[model samples]
Target chain A: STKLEEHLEGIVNIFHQYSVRKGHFDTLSKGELKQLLTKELANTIKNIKDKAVIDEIFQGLDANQDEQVDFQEFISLVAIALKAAHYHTHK
Target chain B: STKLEEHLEGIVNIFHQYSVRKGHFDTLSKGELKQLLTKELANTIKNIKDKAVIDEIFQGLDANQDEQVDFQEFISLVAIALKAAHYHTHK
Candidate 1:
């Protein structure tokens, strides 16, 4: 496949890899989100250094207020981060 | 950089590459979005064969109703397509 497709698949796989660790298989708990942010986006998001911050991030991402981040919510986070990184690096 | 980062950057680059073609350098016109979907997502979205379908997709993606798809809007489409591809393949 193309690199773009590979990357998209990788993003989806990463979410699944973490989301399936506990609770719902299709959603991520705060801890799962933390693990994902820390590992998959270490370079892009270097400021996730505290639990409080993680909680805040999770709160912002959980648009439906369901206390869990589904794939849709998680992908939105990735898209935002990627957009930020793009502008930062491009500018 | 990690493969994930590379992939994210690739997505951003693809957007910019098409977005800069005509009007604004940060948003894609309908034609640009069509080109992007046809070229970059050929494998995942293979049935974009009709202009009406393209128009429908573009209208849905232009969340701001600005007649253009910015990076954020564009990435949402990517995320949705990737999510669908993941489910189809993993099922």
Candidate 2:
């Protein structure tokens, strides 16, 4: 659980920044948000990262697939992430 | 930006389900992925709890952290929870 700390904060910051690029930390803190961003970046560094899994889940969300995840895409991706385990485990 | 979306979604889902199975969800979601998970698992409790930051980013996408995150480890960890507020924040 602790392992994924970076991903969590990144998600929060991404959303907050996407919410108009200006907002309070009441929802997400600068430190916490950065952690999530770091997780995603670090995950990619691991090499164990799956490009295909990323493609399938982030297909339309990417809209360009330039290797960066924008806010709109991030929201849709959240849905897949939530359901992914169910699909993987149940299947 | 799209490449990172998978990371975002994958991470959030992990926190969502993790909360239900192990009291993982913090008061608020780590990212949208976890945010939505709480919505799904909200049925489990009534009291709005305190938010806790995830301590460490997931040890490894691989639950075993055996240097690789196989499907099982990836699936399980991707669908688990964050234990601390944010551990990946940088200065």
Candidate 3:
């Protein structure tokens, strides 16, 4: 795999590892998403930073208000993160 | 930076590296995009596979027919790659 492929695969691996836990197997519960934010994006997202902030973020991603985040929903983080990454790199 | 953050940073690095080239400085010309697809996702995108296929993909990503791919436009690739990644993992 090329660099992007590897990096993307790595990201996928991270999601699956957490998403597969609990009953969803293909989605993430709040607990799982919290764990993911805390462990996977600790440095970039500043380690969950705040409980309510995390809650707000989670709800926004849920989109359907189903309280479970599917893969597409989770991909919003990629966009948000890219927004952040793009902003900082230009400064 | 945890694993996912590192992976994402690597992806951003890959994009910025290509995006910084040429007059656009923050986007990719078709040539820059082709190179990025060829080198950065060679193994995953199967090395651009076909010239026409690449063209269609590029235009779809351009989204505005601007003939250039911006950061958000480039992210379409990420979403696509994720879609492909998600499909394969489930099979």
Candidate 4:
């Protein structure tokens, strides 16, 4: 696997490690998403201090309002954060 | 930075390395996209033997039909591939 493939696999593996813990095996509960954000995204997303903020973020990502986030939705979160980080670094 | 943050950063860095070569520094020309795909997605995407396939994939990814694939568009490709790989691995 190339670096890109490896990194993507890593990201998916991380998501699965947490997503499988409760509820559905393929989707993440709000608490799982919170843990992912706080741990995996520590550098780019900062403290994620407020539970309300996590609620809002999760609500936005859960576009269908199902109260759970699937893989596509999870990657969208990563895409947005990476976009912001990219622009910040380039600027 | 956590492993996830590092992976996201690695992906963004790879994109910029190619995207900066010509035309827009923030987007990838078809040729650049092809190179990135052939090199970075070798294991996941296989040979990419046909030019037309690359053209079609580029068109599909260029959601805005801007002729060039922006970072967001590129990541969408990665996301889709990863999703497929995830399902394949789980299955």
| DockQ for the candidates, in order | 0.59, 0.12, 0.72, 0.75
A78: Cα error in model 1, Å: 1.7
DockQ of 2: 0.12
**lDDT by residue for model 3 over B7-44, one digit each (tens)?**
77787889889988886788899888988888777666
Model 1 lDDT tens row, B19-73: 9998998899999988887877777775766678789889999988989998778
**RMSD of each candidate relative to the true structure:** 2.1, 14.2, 1.9, 1.7
Off by over 4 Å in 2: A1-10, A14-59, A64-68, A88-91, B1-91
Candidate maximizing TM-score: 4
Interface root mean square deviation of every model, in Å? 1.6, 9.2, 1.4, 1.3
Per-residue alpha-carbon lDDT of candidate 1 for residues A1-91, written as tens digits (9 for 90 to 100): 6656777887787778888999999899998998887777777865777777688889989998988998777777887788877777667
Candidate 3 Cα outliers beyond 4 Å, as residue runs = none
Question: DockQ of candidate 1?
Answer: 0.59
Model 2 interface RMSD, one decimal:
9.2
Ranking 3 against 4 by DockQ, winner:
4
Question: B1-91 in candidate 4: lDDT tens per residue?
Answer: 7898788788889998899999999899999999988888766874476688888889999999879999878878877777866875687
Q: List the residue pairs that clash in candidate 4.
A: none
